[PDB]
Structure formats: structure tokens, C-alpha cells
Design a protein around this ligand. Structure first.
Ligand SMILES: *[C@@H]1O[C@H](CO)[C@@H](O)[C@H](O)[C@H]1NC(C)=O
Ligand SMILES: *[C@@H]1O[C@H](CO)[C@@H](O)[C@H](O)[C@H]1NC(C)=O
Lengths: 57, 56, 16, 638
């Protein structure tokens, strides 16, 4: 799809001065991001936008 | 304050209470009279005498 | 009046 | 066909015949002919020769083992045989049923036991319920101690509470060594809970030394894995009373019963294989020829042999040949040197025979800790709320306390409320510990010719030390039970329909009105009824025809129109008119309170705490935390 607005203008201005090249892709789950305890385990896992960043996506 | 405000004139109590506490008789440490005094006070409360005394 | 400290409708759950 | 092998006991010739007899016991959906062998002594060559000859001359599909005098290094030979000949075996008992973690790749052992970490989980479960959290770890120089010391630290980070660890010690507890060094090391310690991992002989040596250096009295507690404890039918000397362990299900069955369970598992596996393909695979027992690359047929059979159930007992084997999700049972040494069950474990929830850890002594008369007591209470919605534990994780939601409605069998509810928060704060300030249990009989108190029921009765007959909750103060109660300072002030109040100028109003003073006869409340066997009767006879006489079940039905009756007036306590009534369907109201208000008293913490007479916890209650009332609790728990809309 095509995106535009506040954060996109900020992103263009940010990318101009530092010479990186972006590839914008939206979120999968659609949730802002929280910490959740997966059943049958105490090792906490991050769900939502906070996971896509932490794993390496 | 509540006695004098409604008693004389022209004075008002602002809002209501914020820190609540009671009134009680004072006696020296571990004196042998306290139990009977409390048993009399509770009996007075149950009779209605402190009620008759209060209106008076 | 939906206050921030505590509303009785918010503090005590209601039906509507 | 199947195979059976015995080892190293009282010669079970009659038991061998009993096992051989039921060729058609018909309890299994199969008719595989059973046979039996038996080795005189246990040794590598002996075992190899007997098994190789048997399966090479018998054409067997499965073989079930039965262990011996409990010597180590026996399961390895069986794993070797299974890996070579590709013949699945199964152990049922003894030392051979101890988990061999990194088994050979292509083998199929299927030994019934429990791993070390899984067996430590139940120990950290039982530690949680009694809230000891001392963690003095002792592990001998055993080939497996490096795994125990890592598993304990791994489970330490897979639980809620901090688990403050104190000291971990490894000492040479073998046959030969310097006793003085270990004496010095053991004499220098202080921790109310010990967890030790050793072997049977090492356990005996360690416990003898500990008994020498004063660590076995009624103060400390020991926990050991099932590797120790030996026979389970001959507890030796120097074993401390109260030693705790966790054994698996079927720690009391018979040998023949366990062999029967093994044959049942084999038969069910074969039958379940038939319902897919329809034939029991042919054997491969060329022990002398030793052939065989990877074989997909026996691989499919083994893959199918993992899972199995049997009338309540499920034996689900993990890839590693130890079963997963068993129903472990905790055991402990009773006061007469005899193992006894204490707590079950089914589906991740622990149970306990006792609400407290019964603690013994040298002369065997049991003692109760000074900083401990038993609290009673019961249900009143604004102050005491009972909630069944949710199916989330067994334990109750935080900021709640475990409570039980006693009556031997129990279901652990949990209690939440106002007085419960007060109790938590009191336990935090006065430095004591408690257990909370609800009452069974009449709600609050009465005297039917000296038979006092309720919390007042439970305190007067010396079965408890306090009684917290909705308990008012009056002259007749305070005669036999002491009381602290009040923290919530109540009285008598009248709720009506949204008409009277007090109790002394002629509508209540004179029940002689013709067309309308007014109607009353007075939940009987309660606090107010005593005063109402003893101070007004005619009202008591006319008050028989009054609705009396609870503070629940009275609201409905008032809203319907079958009652004209309700008389009850103040703190509950004025709260009940907080969040109501519409707005029903009471008379003038707090100006209409009769016999103004307060709630109180009931206590045993001449109790050393009374003075201890009156000051704390006064301190709490002083700085306004009670007002915060009031606005958190006692607020309404209308
Ligand atoms: C307290 O009162 C009881 C009777 O209620 C009486 O027997 C006792 O002597 C009294 N004690 C004192 C110290 O007055
Ligand atoms: C597991 O149990 C199911 C249910 O009966 C069965 O069909 C299956 O063969 C068993 N084994 C495997 C590997 O799924």
C-alpha cells in the first residue's frame, strides 16, 4: 500500500541527513507491543511490535 | 466546635471531619480497674443512658 | 464526571 | 510373544509360575504367548548370554526387565543390547529405572522414571506452599552432582519468588576420607532448610555426621531426591524424622502387578499399531551376526510405541526414554519410622495432608512455633470475600491469601477483603506468621446454654488465637473474650424504601396500629437481635414475622414491597446503599446510629499479643492508611 503523514515526513528528513536507505514494512500482529508469559514456561516473551524488533525482523 | 456553632450564633463548621478519633478515660499502666471501667462503659452504651445523657 | 483520581462508577463497576 | 526376566531377590519360583500361568488373561486386546527366564547372578557376560540366547532361539517381539538388589551400571548394558539388536526393552523397578540421560542414538530403552529437574520441581513446589526459602544446598562428590547443581540453579530462575540462596557445599562423603574437615564444614552453617543430593551410603554417613554436629533437631528440615532413601521398605538409623522425598506413582504396588502393567503397555502398543497397518513386525535377533542399518519398519513401530494410556494411568514417554507428566507423590518419615504419603501432585497443582508442617522433637512430643497462630473468620461481602482459585496456574492471584473452609478432605479457596488487608499489614509489622481458616457453625456468636458457636466459640474453647472480621463489641461477649481497640465504628440502623423518627417512634414503640402493622428485619442469631430483645420485649414479641435469611433477601423483599423497614448493622447497611439498583435510602443518616460501637480483633484472654497488636492498630489509625483502605473498599455511587 502507500503510506504518508507525520512520522513518514520525519523519516524522510531523518534519512536525508544520514544517508541510510529505508525499507518501510508494517507490523504483523497489529498490537503496539507487550510482554507475555507463554503457557508452560516462565521465560517471558515479547509479543507485538516489540518482538519484531527484538528478534531481528 | 459543633456544640458552640449551633449553640450561640453566626458561626459555621467548614465541610466535615478528615481525621477521626475517640474520647477515653486515662489510667496508669496495667492498673486493676480498666476491665471493670470498660465493662461499665459498654453497658452504658447498650442501655441507651449515654443516649439520654447525650440529648440532655 | 469521569475524574482521574477515582470515580465511583469507575471504582465500583456498574452495568451500563 | 513377550519376555520376562527377574533378578536378585528371594527366589521367585512361585512368582515365576504365577507370571507364566495367565497365557490368556484376556485383559489385553492381544493373545501373545508369555514366557519367562531368570539369571542367577547379575553380570555383563551372564546377562549378555542369557538375553542373546533367549531372543535368538525364541523369536520374541518385546522384552520386559525387572531389577535387582539396586546396584548401578546395569542400565548401560541393556541400552547396549537394545542399540545393537534393535529390540525394544522395558524396565519397571529397582536401580535400573534411573534416568540415563544421553542414551545411544538408535536405541529404544523406555525406562519408567523421572528426570532430576522434573523431580526437583515438586520440591520447589512444596517449598513454596510453606514459604521457607532458606536454600542450604549440600551435594557430595558423585558423578552426577554437576547436573544437580545446574538443575537447581536453572529452576531457581523459573519461579516467582526470589529464592534467596544461602550456601552450597560439596564435601567428600565417601568410604575413606578426613572426617574432621567435613565435621568443621558442617558445624559452621545456619539455615532453616537443607537440600542434599547423595547416595545411600553417603546419605547414612552424612546424616550420622549431622546428628553428631547438631543439625537434626526440631529446628531444621531436610529434602532429598529419590536416588537416596534406598529400599523404601527398610529405613535405617540416623535418618532424621521428617525427611521428605518425592516418589512416583506405584511406590507400593507388587512386582507381579508391575510386570502386568508392562505387559499391558506392550499389548496396547501392538494393538494400536494394528489399528493402522495391521501386523506385529517380525523380530530381528541375530545377536551373533549383529546386522542392521537404519530400519524404517521397527522405527515406525517404536514411534508408535511412545504414547499409551491405561484406565487413569497415562504413560507418555519423551524422546529421551523417561516418561513425561507423571503423577508424583510426596512421602515423608512419620513419627514411628515408617514412610507415609503427605502430598499428591496431578496436573501441575500440589496438595498437602497438613495445613502446617507438623514439627517433631527428641522425646517425640510435637511443638508449635512461638511466632505462629491460627486465625478464624467467615464471609461478609464488604470485609471478607472468598474466591475459588482460577484455572490459570493453580496458585491464587497475588494480593490474596490461601484459606480453607474446614469441617479431613479440603479444597483450598483464597480470601480477599478489608480485614484481610489489615491482617497482612499486621503480619508485616508484628513479625508473626498465620494460617487462616473459615468457620462452619453459626455465623458470629450466641449462647445456647453455654454452647457458643461461631468465631467467638472457636476462640473461647481454645482452638484459635484470634478471630478477625465483622465482629462487633458488646458487654456479654467481652466477658470471656478480650478485644483490641476498634478500627471500624458501627451501630444499629434502619433502611427503608425511597417515615420514622427513630427507634423510640411509636411505630416501633407501640405495635398496636390497626390497618398497617409495620415490618422489620433482624437477621436472627446475630449481633443486634440480642440488644433488641433484651431492651424491648414487645418489639421482640411482634418481630417473629420478619424476613430472615441474609442481608441479600432483605434487599429484594424491600424492593418488592413485602417488608416496610430493615434493622441491621451500620457499616454494612450504609455500604449496601452505595451501589444499588436505583437509590433506596435509610433514615436521617449517621445521626441515626444506636448503641455506637466498633469492630474489634477478638483474642484469647491474657494473651501476650493483645498489647503487641493494639499499638500497631493505633499507629495505623493515626497516619491515615485506614482512610485509603476505606476509599478503596468502601465507596459507592449513590
Ligand atoms: C471488678 O468487677 C467485678 C464484678 O464485675 C468484681 O467482682 C471485682 O471485685 C471488681 N474488681 C475491682 C478491682 O474492682
Ligand atoms: C499417539 O496417540 C495416537 C492416539 O491414539 C495414536 O493414533 C498414535 O499412533 C500415537 N503415536 C504417535 C506417534 O502419534
Amino acid at each position: 500500500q502507500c503510506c504518508y503523514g507525520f512520522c513518514i515526513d520525519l523519516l524522510i528528513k531523518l534519512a536525508r541527513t544520514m544517508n541510510f536507505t529505508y525499507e518501510v514494512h508494517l507490523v504483523a500482529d497489529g498490537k503496539f507491543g507487550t510482554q507475555e508469559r507463554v503457557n508452560n514456561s516462565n521465560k517471558k516473551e515479547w509479543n507485538g511490535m516489540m518482538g519484531e524488533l527484538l528478534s531481528g525482523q | 466546635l459543633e456544640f458552640e456553632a449551633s449553640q450561640k450564633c453566626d458561626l459555621v463548621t467548614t465541610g466535615e471531619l478528615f481525621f477521626r478519633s475517640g474520647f477515653g478515660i486515662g489510667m496508669r499502666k496495667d492498673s486493676p480497674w480498666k476491665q471493670n471501667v470498660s465493662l461499665s462503659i459498654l453497658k452504658s452504651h447498650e442501655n441507651g443512658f449515654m443516649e439520654d445523657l447525650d440529648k440532655t | 464526571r469521569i475524574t482521574g483520581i477515582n470515580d465511583p462508577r469507575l471504582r465500583n463497576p456498574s452495568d451500563k | 510373544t513377550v519376555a520376562v526376566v527377574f533378578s536378585s531377590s528371594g527366589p521367585p519360583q512361585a512368582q515365576f509360575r504365577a507370571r507364566l500361568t495367565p497365557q490368556s488373561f484376556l485383559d489385553l486386546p492381544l493373545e501373545i504367548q508369555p514366557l519367562t527366564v531368570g539369571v542367577n547372578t547379575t553380570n555383563p557376560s551372564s546377562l549378555l548370554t542369557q538375553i542373546c540366547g533367549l531372543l535368538g532361539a525364541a523369536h520374541v517381539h518385546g522384552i520386559v526387565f525387572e531389577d535387582n538388589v539396586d546396584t548401578e551400571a546395569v542400565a548401560q548394558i541393556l541400552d547396549f543390547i537394545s542399540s545393537q539388536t534393535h529390540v525394544p526393552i522395558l524396565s519397571i523397578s529397582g536401580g535400573s529405572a534411573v534416568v540415563l540421560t544421553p542414551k545411544e542414538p538408535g536405541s529404544a530403552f523406555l525406562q519408567l522414571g523421572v528426570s532430576l529437574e522434573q523431580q526437583l520441581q515438586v520440591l520447589f513446589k512444596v517449598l513454596e506452599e510453606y514459604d521457607w526459602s532458606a536454600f542450604a544446598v549440600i551435594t557430595s562428590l558423585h558423578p552426577g552432582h554437576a547436573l544437580f547443581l545446574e538443575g537447581v540453579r536453572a529452576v531457581a530462575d523459573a519461579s516467582h519468588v526470589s529464592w534467596r540462596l544461602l550456601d552450597v557445599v560439596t564435601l567428600e562423603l565417601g568410604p575413606g576420607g578426613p572426617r574432621a574437615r567435613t565435621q568443621r564444614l558442617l558445624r559452621q552453617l545456619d539455615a532453616p532448610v537443607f537440600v542434599a543430593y547423595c547416595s545411600r551410603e553417603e546419605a547414612e554417613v552424612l546424616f550420622a555426621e549431622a546428628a553428631q554436629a547438631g543439625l537434626v533437631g526440631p529446628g531444621h528440615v531436610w529434602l532429598v531426591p529419590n536416588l537416596a532413601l534406598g529400599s523404601t521398605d527398610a529405613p535405617p538409623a540416623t535418618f532424621p524424622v521428617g525427611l521428605i522425598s518425592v516418589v512416583t506413582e506405584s511406590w507400593r504396588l507388587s512386582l507381579r502387578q508391575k510386570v502386568r502393567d508392562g505387559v499391558a503397555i506392550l499389548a496396547l502398543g501392538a494393538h494400536s499399531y494394528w489399528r493402522q497397518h495391521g501386523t506385529l513386525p517380525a523380530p530381528a535377533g541375530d545377536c551373533r551376526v549383529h546386522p542392521g542399518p537404519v530400519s524404517p519398519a521397527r522405527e515406525a513401530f517404536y514411534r508408535h510405541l511412545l504414547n499409551v494410556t491405561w484406565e487413569g494411568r497415562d504413560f507418555s514417554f519423551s524422546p529421551g526414554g523417561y516418561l513425561v507428566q507423571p503423577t508424583m507423590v510426596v512421602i515423608a518419615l512419620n513419627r514411628h519410622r515408617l514412610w507415609e504419603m503427605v502430598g499428591r501432585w496431578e496436573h501441575g497443582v500440589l496438595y498437602m495432608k497438613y495445613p502446617v508442617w507438623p514439627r517433631y522433637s527428641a522425646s517425640l512430643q510435637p511443638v508449635v512455633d512461638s511466632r505462629h497462630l491460627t486465625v478464624a473468620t467467615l464471609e461478609e461481602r464488604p470485609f471478607v470475600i472468598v474466591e475459588s482459585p482460577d484455572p490459570g496456574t493453580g496458585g491464587c492471584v497475588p494480593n490474596t491469601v490461601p484459606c480453607r473452609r474446614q469441617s479431613a478432605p479440603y479444597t483450598k479457596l483464597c480470601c480477599k477483603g478489608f480485614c484481610i488487608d489489615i491482617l497482612k499489614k499486621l503480619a508485616r509489622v508484628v513479625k508473626f506468621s498465620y494460617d487462616l481458616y473459615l468457620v462452619t457453625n453459626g455465623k458470629h456468636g450466641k449462647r445456647v446454654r453455654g454452647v457458643w458457636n461461631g468465631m467467638i466459640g472457636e476462640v473461647y474453647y481454645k482452638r484459635a488465637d484470634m478471630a478477625i472480621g465483622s465482629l462487633t463489641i458488646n458487654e456479654e461477649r467481652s466477658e470471656i473474650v478480650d478485644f483490641s481497640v476498634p478500627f471500624v465504628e458501627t451501630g444499629i440502623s434502619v433502611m427503608v424504601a425511597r417515615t420514622v423518627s427513630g427507634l423510640s417512634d411509636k411505630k416501633f414503640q407501640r405495635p398496636q396500629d390497626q390497618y398497617p402493622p409495620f415490618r422489620f428485619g433482624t437477621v436472627p442469631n446475630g449481633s443486634t437481635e440480642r440488644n433488641i430483645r433484651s431492651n424491648y420485649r414487645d418489639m421482640h414479641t411482634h418481630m417473629v414475622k420478619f424476613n430472615q435469611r441474609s442481608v441479600e433477601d432483605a434487599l429484594t423483599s424491600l424492593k418488592m414491597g413485602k417488608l416496610d423497614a430493615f434493622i441491621y448493622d451500620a457499616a454494612v447497611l450504609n455500604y449496601m446503599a452505595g451501589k444499588d439498583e436505583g437509590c433506596k435510602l435509610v433514615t436521617i443518616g449517621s445521626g441515626k446510629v444506636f448503641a455506637t460501637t466498633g469492630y474489634g480483633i477478638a483474642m484469647q484472654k491474657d494473651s501476650h499479643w493483645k498489647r503487641a497488636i493494639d499499638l500497631a492498630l493505633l499507629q495505623f489509625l493515626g497516619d491515615g492508611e485506614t482512610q485509603k483502605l476505606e476509599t478503596v473498599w468502601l465507596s459507592g455511587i449513590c
